[PDB]
Paper text:
Voltage-gated sodium (Nav) channels govern membrane excitability in neurons and muscles. Nav1.7, encoded by SCN9A and primarily localized to the dorsal root ganglion neurons, has been explored as a prominent target for pain management. The S1-S4 segments in each repeat constitute the flanking voltage-sensing domain (VSD), and the S5-S6 segments enclose the PD that is responsible for selective and gated ion permeation. Here we report high-resolution cryo-EM structures of human Nav1.7 treated with drugs and lead compounds with representative chemical backbones at resolutions of 2.6-3.2 Å.
We show that vinpocetine, a synthetic derivative of a vinca alkaloid, and hardwickiic acid, a natural product with antinociceptive effect, bind to the III-IV fenestration, while vixotrigine, an analgesic candidate, penetrates the IV-I fenestration of the pore domain. Although no density for lidocaine is found around this site, densities for VPC and HDA were resolved. A battery of hydrophobic residues on S6III and S6IV are engaged in accommodating VPC or HDA, including Thr1404 on P1III, Trp1332 on S5III, Thr1448, Leu1449, and Phe1452 on S6III, and Ser1697, Ile1744 and Phe1748 in repeat IV. Notably, the binding pose for VPC, which extends deeper into the central cavity, only partially overlaps with that of HDA in the III–IV fenestration.
Author numbering:
A (entry chain A): 8 to 34, 47 to 206, 209 to 418, 728 to 825, 831 to 1014, 1175 to 1768
B (entry chain B): 20 to 192
């Protein structure tokens, strides 16, 4: 008990040695409470003064037999040492060891080490240190040597059981010390310095609670073993498919036909070095670093007249973008899975190979980018949930008085607090009215409004300060926040632009009455509260990655700058200094790494940059994901427990609401009192007949067929409709027929159901609205009103006919029901996000109002320098002197709050954010020419916005969505909400497949030779040998590369033939010892089918390559080789289980995909109707536009993932000259003008991306539920 | 953008008519300088005779009786890069019937390269006394009325058969 305390003396050591000797002559787990680095139990009470920081006996009986002692500090933390002398010189009773132990266990020692490490980390941020820092580095080395000297002589060195070298974290300190001394005595700065960066990792061993976080992260990694195996297998299979399909396609270029001086392509290609000379022979678009890609098919890119397509030269993007070898194909597939700049690769591949290959990208995206990320997410979520379960399981186991009191009475909750809430809302609304082209009177009224609001807020603060005591004022955190905001406002009144935006933080005061905003505040508080250690670990990792990158590639970005920049100046993103390196790391964490990959590999080599970037991605994404799930589940369950009632203390808003309910009702009742004081059998059979007709299955089938035909008739109305007069006329008459048929349907439904029943149905209402619009359009066309403006705008509404298919198919119906059930919970979080983004938008408008204007040289699109033309007036003079000059402004900017909202949407999606970032960091003032990175530290605004308005916002949204879907599932009895009844039956039948008990073993045969073959094949040795044979075949397929010699081709062909013969022999042997029991196993059926497919495919490929000319079909049927390596999943149980989970998720995914396809079809028809004639610039070009249904679907599939939607939106925003031409004449059509409608385009793109996000979230949740069900059963 | 539509093959005597000739460049972003020449051969003759040439925003007409004062340029305006090279005949006459070829000569200006290219497009135009309705409108309309009449007979017939059946149930009641 508490009395078990005594100093460790020589007699105790002698007794321990005697006990050890007795145990040896004769020839259990210690208490976790008494483990090293733990608090002393309270059962022992306080420590008497004379033994703190002194050697005493071992309280743990386990070690009571062995030679150990415990020392206790003033914080009741026990430390375990060894009683064996350190290096056989210093005894425990020696004064020197006593001093060393006194130093070791002390708060000041840890504080000194932490301060030293922090100062060294600060000094690591200087890329070009002065000559005075050498002494400071020497001081740091001396301090580290001092601390490593105490420990080494306190616990010994690898000589004891509890000695210095046994601590895994002590190895880092030893390595730091030896590296520093060795590199000092021996003397590249690149390496030695990059190795000194390890002193930053010592923060984990000095800040308490960080080792546990690191161990938890390692444990979370350890549970991801099978998922990474499946990911690598899938990426390799898709890389082989892409290598087969697109080998050398990205090398196609437009080579000129006419060459003088008897010159040939071969002779040209070896005398070309500069792009200026390359441009003379190949076709380059203006401002393009790479040559224009082409293809030999009719759906690929088209060379200009005078140029022919040829495969010659290097690949695009410094030759890093290709499918030439397995390595580059694997890198491209990883890029597709991570969805980093994948739209550029998608567009290049379509241009070089044809639009028909969009199927490959659809399949690869839907599988590698969706399902594998889902698996990683689900497994990491399981790991964290199990860790949390274990943690919670083990944790549970005079005159002044009179007047100041009168003021307190003046403070009344129902009115004063409601008045202050109204004032806060009014102030936010008033400050949201700032814009750039704003007159002086508007500025004056805004200034006086802000002044009066600040005055009333200060008056409130003073009145509350004199009502309650100043000490009574300061316990409430809200009161402290309000006082701080008031002092900041007063400081601004006495006097930057950022300080004026600190008043918007008062909006969070509404969280006392707004429950959902309080959830966001709780998430933000937990980010630095219960989960502060994880956030600190993430910050340390980011800092380490930034400094490591700056050390490795800082000088390379400067010496090799001309390789990545024609001007020979450092690009926008680089690692020359600490700030830009940190910006690169943050951008990588956001998900953009390939474009910086290219520059890094150009300046410093492929291997180093690849290794560094992959490590950064893996570690950073793992930590960010762990933090995300930690916050999500903590605020999901631990924070919300209904401990208190709804506003246990009567909320002031609730009191005001009750007072209003009393007053308004009483006044209305008194007013009412004052007013009173002052003063058919045959018809029924017809209804019976129409009911029978409507509900029959043939009626349903006929109407579904007509709906499908009517929807499909819309795809034909593209810009080429004037070349198809017959089809156009047939379409008009068919539309008339469809209108008649749907009029008849509407009449029959009216007769059968009745007006009440028909008009109480939402689907019937939608059908009625669509048919009414169609009837109005038809009658207007008949009555000659076919060219009116309103009628022409109504005619574009025929894109809503596919909405009639929602009620006809059960999958879309159930998905729509789930979405409508979820909508009410989505709305409140949408409002909270709007308020938060409004605060950020007001801040952005304040910072960047009208500062994005610049004077450019139009013909090349280059901003003029600031030495000349630094003002708007100088730009005006330059325009009226030189024609190709323009003082233009960005289309998406922070001119007002709506444009700020659009800019924030672009930033949050990380699509088009770079232009806004550059314009913000270059901004100077209003009517001032921007200078390169003049406001360099404006990047902090965007980083803070990204963090707060993306990480926490998405966290809150997903947290509420999980609650909504859990309640939806619970309400209907726990059944799946995305599956129909028949789908449920098939799901149960599939579930019985994956839980079958071991079947009856296949009996041996009576024949001797057949029996020997039987005992041969059924051996596990046969299975493992077949697995290694399949692995060798996969390696053989990987060896293939673009440009290989004919000898290699023949060798690989013969190796593949040998493998095919071996697999055929395997199949034949199996067919004899198994007899007809071979077909009783599905895996054997798959093996049979793949052997047949391999033999047939190789025969057909040989026949085509020998006696035909069709490379495309040759590759398509040579893709059958992939079947052989798909058999590897038989041997691996984990990836087989994951594939079973995917097969489980398939039906719900099919329903959600049907809904998404219908939405995409509607949006494609609308885009064809609207943006078919928009100018071809930015993301719109000859191959990716809205001219054709195929083109529209190509564009919409790209932006279903949010990829490149800014580039598509930008051309539409042109509305007035010189941006567009309102009277542009298009040959072959009567449509005039190439301008776009900004409002229609903005609504189109914003609504589509929002709907796509909702549908993708639904798919994510369905897959995760199917994954959780499979693993936990 | 630019769509190559074929010219209508039918012209009505005494009215106006436009002969379409659209030749779009393979890439829209390129720059070129285009001029066109039109050649016409009447029925009963086997030789093609040049009738007009358009270049640099000025139209030049050959001295031919059949086309003097009844041809105006309907085509691209304001540019030396022309993708609609069409012509309009102000009063059609029987002599106009015959086969017309539009030859477009385009010089495409490229970096270090100029390619000169030619396209010949052939139109056959027949002057007719009165306009003649397309077979497709005539066939489609007859089919829309036959489908609308066929569907109405199936609904009326099915209803008559069902009502007879339901009537029996009420009596059986
Ligand atoms: C924490 C731990 C996390 C993991 C960290 C380590 C991760 C990755 C390490 C990768 C090591 C890369 C070494 C490459 C060595 C090298 O120098 O490579 C040489 C070859 C051949 O280059 P070449 O001269 O023929 O190219 C033509 C020249 N050109 C392109 C300029 C025109 O390069 C090639 O094959 C290009 C190599 C492409 C493969 C990149 C890796 C695959 C993608 C992502 C990994 C997924 C995880
Ligand atoms: C998680 C996602 C959250 C939601 C994000 C959605 C994306 C962002 C939303 C919208 C972005 C674009 C909004 C419009 C941008 C400004 C465009 C503009 O130039 O607008 C100007 C107009 C006023 O025109 P004027 O001064 O030229 O009239 C002159 C009249 N004369 C000539 C007679 C003097 O003002 C206006 O449109 C401003 C009023 C309308 C727009 C208000 C801001 C957006 C509000 C709600 C969005 C809800 C989304 C769900
Ligand atoms: C790129 C790489 C992707 C590879 C896809 C295809 C790989 C090969 C399989 C297709 C042919 C299958 C031949 C016959 C399979 C017989 C069989 O056994 O079918 C079910 C097996 C696993 O059954 P189990 O009871 O051993 O484990 C599941 C039960 N649990 C959860 C308790 C562990 O599922 C499986 O192999 C998964 C079958 C479903 C695969 C569909 C995904 C591709 C689309
Ligand atoms: C690029 C590559 C191009 C070439 C690819 C070639 C190979 C691709 C497709 C061929 C697939 C052939 C069919 C495979 C499954 C055959 C089968 O019979 O499969 C049954 C299993 C479950 O059979 P069981 O183990 O319960 O035994 C049942 C025993 N009996 C039947 C006697 C009662 O079905 C299941 O699991 C369902 C598994 C569904 C797998 C779909 C894979 C799609 C890819
Ligand atoms: C509920 C959330 C979603 C919004 C709450 C804030 C609104 C009250 C803000 C957001 C957008 C604001 C508008 C954004 C842009 C403009 C245009 C602005 O005028 C100009 O830009 C042109 C000035 C000129 O050239 O004379 C006048 C204010 C106004 C209507 C703003 C009025 C206040 C609005 C509606
Ligand atoms: C859901 C998945 C994503 C959407 C998929 C929609 C269906 C798939 C839509 O695919 C459209 C493409 O096929 C269009 O490109 P093509 O090369 O086929 O066009 C050929 C045109 N010519 C040359 C014949 C005239
Ligand atoms: C518009 O036309 C609808 C008709 O085709 C009606 O035919 P049904 O599809 O209703 O035919 C089956 C109806 N009964 C006869 C089975 C009730
Ligand atoms: C389940 C819901 C299903 C909804 C289906 C809606 C209709 C879906 C119809 O899909 C196919 C059409 O889009 C094809 O349109 P095209 O114009 O490409 O076809 C003709 C092409 N040529 C011949 C002119 C080149
Ligand atoms: C400018 C033009 C803008 C056009 C906008 C068009 C928006 C269309 C939105 C359609 C949105 C989808 O259609 C509405 C239906 O969802 C309503 O019916 P419910 O889903 O509530 O039915 C549930 C199932 N029971 C309860 C009836 C059985
Ligand atoms: C987004 C695109 C998603 C594409 C998914 C493709 C793979 C999924 C394609 O369907 C996979 C089938 O196993 C289930 O198909 P169904 O849901 O049509 O049939 C379910 C069972 N009943 C209804 C027939 C009884
Ligand atoms: C399921 C969906 C099935 C349909 C998928 C989309 C098919 C889409 C089929 O599109 C056919 C054409 O409209 C494409 O025309 P292009 O843009 O290639 O230009 C042709 C130019 N010339 C050759 C006429 C001069
Ligand atoms: C389901 C999600 C629904 C999301 C819809 C949200 C979109 C709303 C914003 C549409 C966008 C709001 O429309 C009006 C503005 O776009 C006006 O823009 P401008 O003033 O630039 O117009 C050009 C000439 N001045
Ligand atoms: C805007 O920038 C110009 C840059 O020189 C300022 O300087 C004037 O420039 C014009 C032509 O270059 C001269 O005619 C003036 O005499 C220059 N004045 C001065 C004071 O240098 C100009 O003052 C600036 N205008 C504004 C509105 O700030
Ligand atoms: C081919 O090139 C050679 C280069 O010396 C030149 O002398 C010769 O005239 C050329 N012949 C033709 C056919 O252009
Ligand atoms: C600027 O340009 C014109 C020529 O277009 C020049 O003659 C004059 O100095 C300036 N005119 C105006 C209106 O500023
Ligand atoms: C063309 O001119 C003739 C007279 O030669 C005239 O009768 C005819 O109406 C004119 N047609 C048109 C369309 O002007
Ligand atoms: C064609 O010429 C006629 C008569 O000169 C004219 O009315 C018509 O507008 C012109 N059309 C075009 C597009 O040039
Ligand atoms: C048209 O040309 C024919 C050539 O035989 C001539 O006879 C006829 O009079 C001409 N008609 C006119 C006035 O265009």
């Amino acid at each position: 008990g508490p009395q078990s305390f005594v100093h460790f003396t020589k007699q105790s050591l002698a007794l321990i040695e005697q006990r050890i000797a007795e145990r040896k002559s004769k020839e259990p787990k210690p208490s976790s409470d008494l483990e090293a680095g733990k608090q002393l139990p309270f059962i022992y009470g306080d420590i008497p003064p004379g033994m703190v920081s002194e050697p005493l006996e071992d309280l743990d009986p386990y070690y009571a037999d062995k030679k150990t002692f415990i020392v206790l500090n003033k914080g009741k933390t026990i430390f375990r040492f060894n009683a064996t002398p350190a290096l056989y010189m210093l005894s425990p009773f020696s004064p020197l060891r006593r001093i060393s132990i006194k130093i070791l266990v002390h708060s000041l020692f840890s504080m000194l080490i932490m301060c030293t490490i922090l100062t060294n980390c600060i000094f690591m941020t200087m890329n070009n240190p002065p000559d005075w820092t050498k002494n400071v580095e020497y001081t740091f080395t001396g301090i580290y040597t001092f601390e490593s000297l105490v420990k080494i002589l306190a616990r010994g060195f690898c000589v004891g059981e509890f000695t210095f070298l046994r601590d895994p974290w002590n190895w880092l300190d030893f390595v730091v010390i030896v590296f520093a001394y060795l590199t000092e005595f021996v003397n590249n700065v690149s390496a030695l310095r990059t190795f000194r960066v390890l002193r930053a990792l010592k923060t984990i061993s000095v800040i308490p609670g960080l080792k546990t976080i690191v161990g938890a992260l390692i444990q979370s990694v350890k549970k991801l073993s099978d998922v990474m195996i499946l990911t690598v297998f899938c990426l390799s299979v898709f890389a082989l498919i892409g290598l087969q399909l697109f080998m050398g396609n990205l090398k196609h270029k437009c080579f000129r036909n006419s060459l003088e001086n008897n010159e040939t392509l071969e002779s040209i290609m070896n005398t070309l070095e500069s792009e200026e000379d390359f441009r003379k022979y190949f076709y380059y678009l203006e401002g393009s670093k790479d040559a224009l890609l082409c293809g030999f098919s009719t759906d690929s890119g088209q060379c200009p007249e005078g140029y022919t397509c040829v495969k010659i030269g290097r690949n695009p993007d410094y030759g890093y973008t290709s499918f030439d070898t397995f390595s580059w194909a694997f890198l491209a597939l990883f890029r597709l899975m991570t969805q980093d700049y994948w739209e550029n690769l998608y567009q290049q591949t379509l241009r070089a190979a044809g639009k028909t290959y969009m199927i490959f990208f659809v399949v690869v995206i839907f599988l590698g980018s969706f399902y594998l990320i889902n698996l990683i997410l689900a497994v990491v979520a399981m790991a964290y949930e199990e860790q949390n379960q274990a943690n919670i399981e083990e944790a549970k186991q005079p005159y002044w008085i009179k007047f100041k009191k009168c003021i307190y009475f003046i403070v009344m909750d129902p009115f004063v607090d409601l008045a202050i809430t109204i004032c806060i809302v009014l102030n936010t609304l008033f400050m949201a009215m700032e814009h750039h082209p704003m007159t002086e009177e508007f500025k004056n009224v805004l200034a006086i409004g802000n002044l009066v609001f600040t005055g009333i807020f200060a008056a409130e603060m003073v009145l509350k300060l004199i009502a309650m005591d100043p000490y009574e004022y300061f316990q409430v955190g809200w009161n402290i926040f309000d006082s701080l905001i008031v002092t900041l406002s007063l400081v601004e009144l006495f006097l930057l632009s950022v300080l004026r935006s600190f008043r918007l933080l008062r909006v969070f005061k509404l969280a006392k009455s707004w429950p959902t905003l309080n959830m966001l505040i709780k998430i933000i508080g937990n980010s630095v509260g219960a989960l502060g250690n994880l956030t600190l670990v993430l910050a340390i990792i980011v800092f380490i990655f930034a400094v490591v990158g700056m050390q490795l590639f800082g000088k390379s970005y400067k010496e090799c700058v001309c390789k990545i920049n024609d001007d020979c100046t450092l690009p926008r993103w680089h690692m020359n200094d600490f700030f830009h390196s940190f910006l690169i790391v943050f951008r990588v964490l956001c998900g953009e790494w390939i474009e910086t990959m290219w520059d890094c590999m150009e300046v410093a080599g492929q291997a180093m940059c690849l290794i560094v970037y992959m490590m950064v991605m893996v570690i950073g994404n793992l930590v960010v994901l762990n933090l995300f799930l930690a916050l999500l589940l903590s605020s999901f369950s631990s924070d919300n427990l209904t401990a208190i009632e709804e506003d246990p203390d009567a909320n002031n808003l609730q009191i005001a609401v009750t007072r209003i309910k009393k007053g308004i009702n009483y006044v209305k009742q008194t007013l009412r009192e004052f007013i009173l004081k002052a003063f058919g059998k045959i018809w029924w059979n017809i209804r019976k007949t129409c009911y029978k007709i409507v509900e029959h299955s043939w009626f349903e089938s006929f109407i579904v067929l007509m709906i499908l035909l009517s929807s499909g008739a819309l795809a034909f109305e593209d810009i080429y409709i004037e070349r198809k007069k017959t089809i156009k006329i047939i379409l008009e008459y068919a539309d008339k027929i469809f209108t008649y048929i749907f009029i008849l349907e509407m009449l029959l439904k009216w007769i059968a159901y009745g007006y009440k029943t028909y008009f109480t149905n939402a689907w019937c209402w939608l059908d009625f609205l669509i048919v009414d619009v169609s009837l109005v359009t038809l009658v207007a066309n008949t009555l000659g009103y076919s060219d009116l403006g309103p009628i022409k705008s109504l005619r574009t509404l025929r894109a809503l006919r596919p909405l009639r298919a929602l009620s006809r198919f059960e999958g879309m119906r159930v998905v729509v029901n789930a979405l409508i059930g979820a909508i009410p919970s989505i709305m409140n979080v949408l409002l909270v996000c709007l308020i938060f983004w409004l605060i950020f938008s007001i801040m952005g408008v304040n910072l960047f109002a009208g500062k994005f204007y610049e004077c450019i040289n139009t013909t090349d699109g280059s901003r003029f320098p600031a030495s000349q033309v630094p003002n708007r007036s100088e730009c005006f003079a330059l325009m009226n002197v030189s024609q190709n000059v323009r003082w233009k402004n960005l289309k998406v900017n922070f001119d007002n709050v709506g444009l700020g909202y659009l800019s924030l949407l672009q930033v949050a999606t990380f699509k088009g954010w770079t232009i806004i970032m550059y314009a913000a960091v270059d901004s100077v003032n209003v009517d001032k020419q921007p200078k390169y990175e003049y406001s360099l530290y404006m990047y902090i605004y965007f980083v803070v916005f990204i963090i707060f308005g993306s990480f926490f916002t998405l966290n809150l949204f997903i947290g509420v969505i999980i609650d909504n879907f859990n309640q939806q599932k619970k309400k209907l009895g726990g059944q799946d909400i995305f599956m129909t009844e028949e789908q449920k039956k098939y799901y149960n039948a599939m579930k019985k497949l994956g839980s079958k008990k071991p079947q009856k073993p296949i009996p041996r045969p009576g024949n001797k030779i057949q029996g020997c073959i039987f005992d041969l094949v059924t051996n596990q040795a046969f299975d493992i040998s077949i697995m290694v044979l399949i692995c060798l075949n996969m390696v053989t397929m990987m060896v293939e590369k673009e440009g290989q010699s004919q000898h290699m081709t023949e060798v690989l062909y013969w190796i593949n033939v040998v493998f095919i013969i071996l697999f055929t022999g395997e199949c034949v042997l199996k067919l004899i010892s198994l007899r007809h029991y071979y077909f009783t196993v599905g895996w054997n059926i798959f093996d049979f089918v793949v052997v047949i497919i391999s033999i047939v495919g190789m025969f057909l490929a040989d026949l085509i390559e020998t006696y035909f000319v069709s490379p495309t079909l040759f590759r398509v049927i040579r893709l059958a080789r992939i079947g052989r390596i798909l058999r590897l999943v038989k041997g691996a149980k984990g990836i087989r289980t994951l594939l079973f989970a995917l097969m489980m998720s398939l039906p719900a995914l099919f329903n959600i995909g049907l809904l998404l396809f219908l939405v995409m079809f509607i949006y494609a028809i609308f885009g064809m109707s609207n943006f078919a004639y928009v100018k071809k610039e930015d993301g719109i070009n000859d191959m990716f536009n809205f001219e054709t249904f195929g083109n529209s679907m190509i564009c919409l599939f790209q932006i279903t993932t949010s990829a490149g939607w800014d580039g598509l939106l930008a051309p539409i925003l042109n509305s007035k000259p010189p941006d567009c031409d309102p009277k542009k004449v298009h040959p072959g059509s009567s449509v005039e003008g190439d301008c776009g409608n900004p409002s229609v385009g903005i609504f189109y793109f914003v609504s589509y991306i929002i709907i796509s996000f909702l549908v993708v979230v639904n798919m994510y949740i369905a897959v995760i539920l199917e994954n959780f069900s499979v693993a936990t059963e | 953008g630019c769509v190559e539509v074929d010219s209508e093959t039918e012209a009505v005597y005494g009215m106006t008519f436009k002969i379409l000739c659209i030749s779009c460049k393979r890439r829209s972003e390129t720059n070129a300088e285009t001029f066109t020449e039109w050649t016409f051969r009447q029925k009963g003759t086997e030789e093609f005779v040049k009738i007009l040439r358009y270049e640099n925003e000025v139209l030049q007409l050959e001295e031919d009786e059949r086309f003097e004062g009844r041809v105006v340029w309907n085509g691209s305006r304001g540019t030396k890069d022309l993708q609609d090279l069409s012509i309009f005949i102000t009063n059609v006459t029987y002599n106009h019937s015959g086969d017309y070829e539009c030859h477009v000569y385009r010089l495409l200006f490229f970096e270090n390269y100029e390619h000169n290219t030619s396209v010949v497009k052939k139109i056959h135009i027949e002057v007719v006394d009165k306009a003649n309705r397309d077979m497709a409108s005539i066939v489609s309309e007859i089919m829309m009325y036959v489908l609308i009449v066929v569907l109405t007979i199936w609904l009326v017939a099915e209803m008559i058969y069902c009502y007879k059946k339901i009537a029996a149930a009420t009596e059986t009641a």
